[PDB]
Amino acid sequence: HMPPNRRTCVFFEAPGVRGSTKTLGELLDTGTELPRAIRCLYSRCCFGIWNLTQDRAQVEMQGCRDSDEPGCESLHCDPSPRAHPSPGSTLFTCSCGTDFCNANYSHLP
Amino acid sequence: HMPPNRRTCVFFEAPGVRGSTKTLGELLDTGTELPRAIRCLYSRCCFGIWNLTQDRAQVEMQGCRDSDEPGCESLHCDPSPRAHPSPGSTLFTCSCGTDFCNANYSHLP
Amino acid sequence: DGPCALRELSVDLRAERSVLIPETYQANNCQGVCGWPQSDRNPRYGNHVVLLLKMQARGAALARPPCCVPTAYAGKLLISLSEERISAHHVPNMVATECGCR
Amino acid sequence: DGPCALRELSVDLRAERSVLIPETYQANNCQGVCGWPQSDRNPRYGNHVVLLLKMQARGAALARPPCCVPTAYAGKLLISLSEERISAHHVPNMVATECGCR
Ligand SMILES: *[C@@H]1O[C@H](CO)[C@@H](O)[C@H](O)[C@H]1NC(C)=O
Ligand SMILES: *[C@@H]1O[C@H](CO)[C@@H](O)[C@H](O)[C@H]1NC(C)=O
DSSP, rough: OOOOOOOEEEEOTTTTTTEOSSSGGGEEESSOSSSSEEESSSSSSSSEEEEESSEEEEEEEEOOOOOTTTTTTOOOOOOOOEEEEEEEEEEEEEEETTTTTOOOOSOOO | OOOOOEEEEEEETTTEEEEEEGGGGOOOSSSSSSEEEEEESSSSSSEEEEEEEOHHHEEEEEEOSSSOOTTTOOSSOOEEEEEEEEEEEEEEEEEEESSSTOOOSOOOO | OBSSHHHHHHOOOSSSSEEOOOOOEEOOOEBBBSSSOOOOOSOOOOOHHHHHHHHHHTOOOOOOOOOOEEEEEEEEEEEEETTTTTEEEEEEEEEEEEEOOO | BSSSSEOEEEEEOOOSSSSOOOOOEOOEEEESSOOOOOOOSOOOOOOHHHHHHHHHHHHHOOSSOOEEEEEEEEEEEEEEEHHHHEEEEEEEEEEEEEEOOO
């Protein structure tokens, strides 16, 4: 009918993830083809979480933020390290404020 | 069966009184003969309120206190002026801590 | 002094014009220190005051540092005088019954 | 300064070990003066703090004078790390949403 007035984000939650952020938005019909999109209810901010191992990087969570907090004004996803669960894994998180900006990042050197 | 473990007070509320203090105790069976007695639930303190006019003094309220507050340690009722609703009426109140002590006072000069 | 706890405090209602009973009563008040970690028999701190105290412990001058305030109240049956009629009515929030840090 | 009101306050959760999201967020804080009579857009004072302020106005040094504290809170959806598993869970009392004097 008309363009979305609210923010849309990539939505994904790996099997190892407990809980969910789906309550922070409404899942859109993506043509039943991957990946899912979610329209945020409480913010204009998307987030992304990546697990960085020896040579590879796995997306763990993608979705909406529950509010607009510092760092959300970024137009694109620039991840920074947030967790060190094991000596071989580092969890990086990014937040940004444009549609589908949490899809991926440029590079993590 | 046994003597009352809780405080007992004279209970009376004149028709002009709005509300009630009966929720502060349990009315006893006084032989269905005046006046009523009430066994206090939340204190060991009886209270009395008198309306002093030109030449006469009308009891307005008698019953239980909702807690033991300063002045309740008195063994007998010694009223002191608390209100001046009209130039010809003065409301006196007393509180005391023995059974039926709120029945009456010695004198108000 | 000591930790945040409930302290006795008498309040006089003879100043209030219409109140007949009570004349003085125990309203209590919360008073004490909001230490970190907490050492008081009050319920555990809320997450908000916990984050405040942890900001302050890292050397942050809070504009409004944590405060020991009542978190629960109880009412009192007040006998007052409206017009020239006596009214016995329940008045809430007359007595502090539980303390906390916020 | 001013009367008792809600003020913005950033809280950093990168100090907290397991928290992934958020890293910083608006938790807010209550700050201001608890004047008598009150002049603030907060809800009306409770009877307890009213009697406290009226004691203080008659020249009584309160051991714990009235304090501007939060009276209502809101939670936040925190994404944390327990063991080596990521958990998205609601944590209450993370944001101060309403102020009062107590
Ligand atoms: C006190 O007594 C007078 C005379 O009977 C009456 O007019 C007045 O209403 C009474 N006051 C109260 C508070 O009952
Ligand atoms: C990161 O990836 C490694 C290797 O697949 C895995 O063992 C570990 O559990 C992952 N960490 C998280 C938080 O998913």
